[model samples]
Target: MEKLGDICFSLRYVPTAGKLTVVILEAKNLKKMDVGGLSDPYVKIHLMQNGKRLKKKKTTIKKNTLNPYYNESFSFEVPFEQIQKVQVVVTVLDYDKIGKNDAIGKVFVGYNSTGAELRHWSDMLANPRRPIAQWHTLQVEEEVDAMLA
Candidate 1:
C-alpha cells in the first residue's frame, strides 16, 4: 500500500502592472526507497485566474543530476487594473516513488490582494467563492496572429 499526500503553498501579494506571479506545486523529500528506481516526479498546475480555473499545465522540472531535488512552478501574467484575485490549484499526477495512478497531493491557494478598481470577491480556498464560480471560458478565433505561431 502507498500513502497519498497533499502539498500546499500560500501567500499574499499586492498587484502591480506587468507583475507576474510564479507559483509552484512540488513533490518533496522523495527518498530512494520512496521512488523505487526513478529520479524525478511529475508536477502539474491547474490555474485559477480571475475566479475561474483557466487551464491545467505540466510544469518543467530540471533534471536532478546535480542537486538531487525536484519541483515545478507555473507563472501567470496578471494585469494590475482589471485583476481582482487569482487562485492556483496544484496536483501531482505521478511521482518517482509512487505508482503512475497514485494521486498524492493538492495545493489550494487563496489570494486577497488586488487593485482599487476590482470588486470584492470572497476567498476561493479549496471551496471556490460562491456566485463567482470557476467558469471554463471558451472563445471563437477569428484570425491567427503573426505572434501566435
Candidate 2:
C-alpha cells in the first residue's frame, strides 16, 4: 500500500490576537522504519504561504514506538492578514544516528488542498483558539519541495 499511518492533530487560529496554533496529539499504526521493527519517531512541520516555504519546527522524538503519543503544541504569531495565505505541512520521520532521517509520511492542509486536509483548515476558522482536532492519512513523501521565487 502507498499509505503510512494516521496522524491526529488540530489547528487553531486566533483572530485579532494574531496567533496560529497546532497540536500534534499522536500518530498510530506507524510503519516501522528501521531494522528489528522499531523507530525513533519525530515530526517536522513546515509553514507554507503562497506556495513558498516560510518556517519549520519539529517535535521531540519518541523512541521505538509504533503508536507515539505526543501532546506537544506549537504556535505562531500570525494575524488575519497572513492567515489566509498559510498552509501547514507536516512530515513524520524516523530518526537515526548513523544516517539520514527516514520519512514515515508527509501531509499538507490548507486552501490549495482537498478533502480532509481542506476541512481541517475550515474547522479551525469556525472555532478559534480552542483547537479542532482530526485524523489524517499520510501520503508519500515524494512531492517536490520547490521554493518558488
Candidate 3:
C-alpha cells in the first residue's frame, strides 16, 4: 500500500461577515484510488459543535490527478466565542461512478487534534480576516477499511 499524502489549505475568519472560511488549496502525492490508476478527488468539510455534527460545505471534484489544486472556498457562521468548542474535519475522498466512494485521507483542525492543529485554528481567531495557510499530512482513519468494505 502506498502512503497517503498531505494537503495544503488555509483558514480565515471574518467577524463582520459572520463567517469562518476554509480554502481547499491543493493536495499532492495522493494515493491512486482505483484500477484505472486515476483518482477523482474532492473535499468534505464538517463542523462538530457541542456533539452535533454539521456538514458545512464541500469542494468540487478534480479529475484524474494525483496532485490536485482546488483553490476553492467554503464558509460557515461560527461565532468567535464558540469557535474554541468547535472541531473541524476535512476529508479527502475519491469519487466513484458505479460504486461507493472511498476516503483518501483526513485531517482534523480543532480542539480534538494535536497542539499544532489547535494552534493553527487559534491563529485564525487571533487575527480575523488574515488567512492562515498550512500543510498537513493526511491520516488514515481506522474505520476507512470498513467503510470501503
- State residue 116's C-alpha deviation in candidate 1, in Å: 26
> What TM-score does each of the candidates earn?
0.44, 0.92, 0.87
Best by lDDT: 2
- How many steric clashes does model 3 contain? 0
Alpha-carbon lDDT of model 2? 0.84
Evaluate all candidate structures by whole-model CA lDDT and list the values in order.
0.37, 0.84, 0.80
**Candidate 2 per-residue C-alpha lDDT over 1-149 given as tens digits, one digit per residue, 9 for 90 to 100:** 47588889989998888888888999988888999778789998888887777888999999999789999999888778888878888889999989799998888887577788889999898887488989988777875243212
**Better candidate number, 1 or 2, judged by TM-score:** 2
Those runs of model 1 whose alpha carbons end farther than 4 Å from true positions after fitting are 1-14, 23-26, 29-40, 49-51, 61-68, 71-73, 81-83, 95-101, 111-149
Clashing pairs in 3: none
Candidate 3 lDDT trough over 10 residues, lowest sum: 140-149
* lDDT score, candidate 3, position 85: 74
Location of the lowest summed lDDT over 10 successive residues in candidate 2: 140-149
Q: In model 2, which runs have C-alpha deviations exceeding 4 angstroms?
A: 144-149
